Amino acid sequence: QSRAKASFDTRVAAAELALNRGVVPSFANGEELLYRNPDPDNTDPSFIASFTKGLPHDDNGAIIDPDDFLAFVRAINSGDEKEIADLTLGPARDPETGLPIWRSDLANSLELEVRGWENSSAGLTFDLEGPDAQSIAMPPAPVLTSPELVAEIAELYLMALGREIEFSEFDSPKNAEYIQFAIDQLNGLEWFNTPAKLGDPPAEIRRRRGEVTVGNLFRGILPGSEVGPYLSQYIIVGSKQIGSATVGNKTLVSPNAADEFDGEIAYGSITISQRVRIATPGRDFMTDLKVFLDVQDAADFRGFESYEPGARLIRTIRDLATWVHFDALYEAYLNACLILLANGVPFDPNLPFQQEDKLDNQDVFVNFGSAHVLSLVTEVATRALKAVRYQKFNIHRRLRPEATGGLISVNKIAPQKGESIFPEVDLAVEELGDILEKAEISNRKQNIADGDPDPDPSFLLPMAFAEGSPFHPSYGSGHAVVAGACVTILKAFFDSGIEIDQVFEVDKDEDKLVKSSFKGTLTVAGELNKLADNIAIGRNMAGVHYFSDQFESLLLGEQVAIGILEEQSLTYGENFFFNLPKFDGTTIQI
């Protein structure tokens, strides 16, 4: 048939193949209508566990008008420009000047404006490749009264108080006290010590973590994430620089070969510096109740973080939070791809024309080569982000971890004033005694540094971002969804089973890379899974996503990338398939 007709038939076949996977029914966990207003005469939902950021709140963190949130859900579902623009985002505005009235003196002094929701209607957007944004489902979110939410909040609080601790010094005497405290606190939760029971949802069993030790503290449960050093190589180490290529029998050593171990990627002919901007040690954000409520009222605190001069490799937990703050959602994975290409890590052996050119008489650049893997790893980003935008806005609308920190703060502060509100995070407040008193001390220090001479006790979750979380629900996680998608693309493309010869870890005292104490071996698949875990959990260290958000988002992104590869494989007429190890350990040939 005609080439135009053949291409049209190929696109139609890809669309039909996307259809054949079907729409997995995505179920919310019901926190939207389960929690009602505590007022005896008001039966309207409190929407405390829903993503009520941007809508006006009272002094306690819930929305003053529930109909504000139903309008938000209607705008999400319809996606109309005017309907979204008609929402009551932000607090009451000053009639004379139009500036919204902020609770905190900081936001009022800054004369902050409101910030809108980040692409509420992106879930409704269709995709020309991969599964539709609504064609793939994520499991019901953890409930506020469930022990899983308690464990997630414990883990995030323990990252917040340990944002100044270094990844290389997790098992170090100086950080031993805090690391053991965090391990004991996590192992004291029903989620970690008690194993999954028969009859629980399969995703809940799959995403349930076991006993927390030093070797898996603040780590994901992806295969290869819990082995070797904490930081993935493709997040710290550079790459084989320009000029370090073997031509014929001889191999030239680039004069800039030291940049490979310095943490400098060979971004083609230029260099990507793996060193991250140094956010100020110990400066957490949204530790004040008024500032937290202003941020929940859509305070545009974006860019308010203070940074130290220069840049350094990821060493502290706050450094990883900064790394994932303005991450491009494929910056980490494009960096991994560039490292793999520069390092000479060959693609999947099942890809065509991967042999030495004496045999196949063909070099792979546009297809099954550098350009193809780069383009696929950065194009899996948009479809995955649309899928996670659907899972965030149109189904789950989970409250952000800063919102669950605010609920816990008001719950633990209410007895001090003789009140009692949010009997939903009561289990969390009871279970997080030591964690929440450490958090109270940390937030008192942070508020004293902020300018409050004697701040009231605040058990709010310390957060590395001035603006708090991005302005979309916590479940699922956009960076973890694109993590799963891009890392799955890279594992399908590159020979993911290849062991890494040089395992590098950041120095205890210096800003440079040294050989890790890990005497074992790490695969390329292991490194990419560790990088996906790193980028996902760096959001937890920012306090912007829970762990279950990260894991289920990684699985959803894995589905996104699998669908894209299945649809893309129809385009290439070569006999080939992607030997892709999934996040569950099984390998799917695409």
Residue 357 contact, options Ca ion, Br ion, ligand VO4, none, Cβ 5-8 Å cut-off depending on partner type:
Ca ion
Residue from the set 59, 65, 67, 81 that interacts with a copy of itself by CB under 8 A: 81
Q: Is residue 412 involved in binding ligand VO4 (CB under 6 A)? A: no
Residue from the set 100, 478, 484, 538 that interacts with Br ion by CB under 5 A: 478
Query: Other C-beta atoms within 10 Å of 441: how many?
Result: 13
Which amino acid appears at position 193 of this protein? Answer: N
What mask, x for binding a copy of itself by CB under 8 A, covers residues 90 to 109?
x-------x-x------x-x
- Six token digits for residue 193: 């010590």
Q: Is residue 139 involved in binding ligand VO4 (CB under 6 A)? A: no
CA distance 523 to 224: 8
Pick the closest to residue 525 from 452, 578, 460 (CA basis).
578
Least CB distance to a copy of itself at residue 158 (A): 23
Q: Is residue 139 involved in binding a copy of itself (CB under 8 A)? A: no
Least CB distance to a copy of itself at residue 207 (A): 24
**Phi/psi of residue 570, nearest 5 degrees:** -70, -25
Does 362 count as an annotated binding residue? Answer: yes
Least CB distance to Ca ion at residue 361 (A): 8
Residue 357 or 499 having the CB closest to Ca ion: 357
| HSE-CB of 305 using CA atoms within 13 angstroms | 28
Q: Name residues contacting Br ion, limited to 221-250 (CB under 5 A).
A: none
Least CB distance to ligand VO4 at residue 389 (A): 9
Pick the closest to residue 565 from 588, 547, 549 (CA basis).
588
- Six token digits for residue 143: 């409930």
Does 121 count as an annotated binding residue? Answer: no
Run of H or E residues at 265:
strand 264-267
Which amino acid appears at position 79 of this protein? Answer: G
Does residue 65 come out as left (phi exceeding 0), alpha (psi in the -120 to 50 range) or beta?
beta
Residue 77 contact, options a copy of itself, Br ion, ligand VO4, none, Cβ 5-8 Å cut-off depending on partner type:
none
Q: Cα 428 to the chain's mean position, in Å?
A: 23
Least CB distance to Ca ion at residue 576 (A): 13
Residue 66 or 478 having the CB closest to ligand VO4: 478
Pick the closest to residue 113 from 286, 306, 305, 294 (CA basis).
294
CA distance 298 to 115: 5
Q: Is residue 123 involved in binding Br ion (CB under 5 A)? A: no
Instruction: Render the burial of 178-205: b for 16+ CB within 10 Å, e for the rest.
Output: bbebbbebbebbebbeeeeeeeeeebbe
**Between β-strands 499-500 and 270-273, what pairing exists: parallel, antiparallel or unpaired?**
unpaired
Q: Name residues contacting ligand VO4, limited to 495-554 (CB under 6 A).
A: 539, 544-545
372 given a catalytic annotation: no
Residue from the set 104, 244, 446, 469 that interacts with ligand VO4 by CB under 6 A: 469
Residue from the set 150, 153, 160, 242 that interacts with a copy of itself by CB under 8 A: 242
- Report whether 512 contacts 538 (CB < 8 A): no
**Phi/psi of residue 176, nearest 5 degrees:** -65, -40
Peptide bond into 476 cis (omega under 30): yes
Does 545 count as an annotated binding residue? Answer: yes
Q: Is residue 357 involved in binding Ca ion (CB under 5 A)? A: yes
**Phi/psi of residue 398, nearest 5 degrees:** -65, 140
| Count of residues engaged in binding ligand VO4, rule: CB under 6 A | 10
| Count of residues engaged in binding Br ion, rule: CB under 5 A | 1
Does 46 count as an annotated binding residue? Answer: no
396 given a catalytic annotation: no
Residue from the set 29, 391, 477, 559 that interacts with ligand VO4 by CB under 6 A: 477
CA-to-CA dists, residue 476 to 18, 134, 195, 317, 556, angstroms: 22, 13, 24, 22, 9
Residue with tokens 């060193």, as numbered in its chain: 275
Q: Is residue 332 involved in binding ligand VO4 (CB under 6 A)? A: no
Does 353 count as an annotated binding residue? Answer: yes
Residue from the set 111, 184, 190, 360 that interacts with Ca ion by CB under 5 A: 360
Least CB distance to Ca ion at residue 526 (A): 26
Q: Is residue 281 involved in binding a copy of itself (CB under 8 A)? A: no
| HSE-CB of 29 using CA atoms within 13 angstroms | 24
Pick the closest to residue 321 from 557, 545, 551 (CA basis).
545
Least CB distance to ligand VO4 at residue 548 (A): 13
Q: Name residues contacting Ca ion, limited to 60-119 (CB under 5 A).
A: 116
Least CB distance to ligand VO4 at residue 245 (A): 17
CA distance 72 to 92: 17
Q: What is the DSSP code string of 144-194?
A: TTSHHHHHHHHHHHHHHHTTTSBSTTTTSHHHHHHHHHHHHHHHTSHHHHS
Q: By CB under 8 A, which span of 117-125, 288-296, 415-423, 437-445 interacts with a copy of itself? A: 117-125
Q: Name residues contacting ligand VO4, limited to 95-124 (CB under 6 A).
A: none
- Six token digits for residue 253: 């050593």
Q: By CB under 6 A, which span of 33-41, 224-232, 444-452, 467-475 interacts with ligand VO4? A: 467-475
**Between β-strands 499-500 and 276-279, what pairing exists: parallel, antiparallel or unpaired?**
unpaired
**Residues flagged as binding site for Ca(2+):** 353, 355, 357, 360, 362
Return residues touching Ca ion (CB under 5 A). 116, 353, 357, 360
Return residues touching Br ion (CB under 5 A). 478
Return residues touching ligand VO4 (CB under 6 A). 469-470, 472, 477-480, 539, 544-545
**Residues flagged as binding site:** 353, 355, 357, 360, 362, 392, 400, 477-479, 539, 545
| Catalytic residue positions, numbered | 472, 479
**Residues flagged as binding site for vanadate:** 392, 400, 477-479, 539, 545
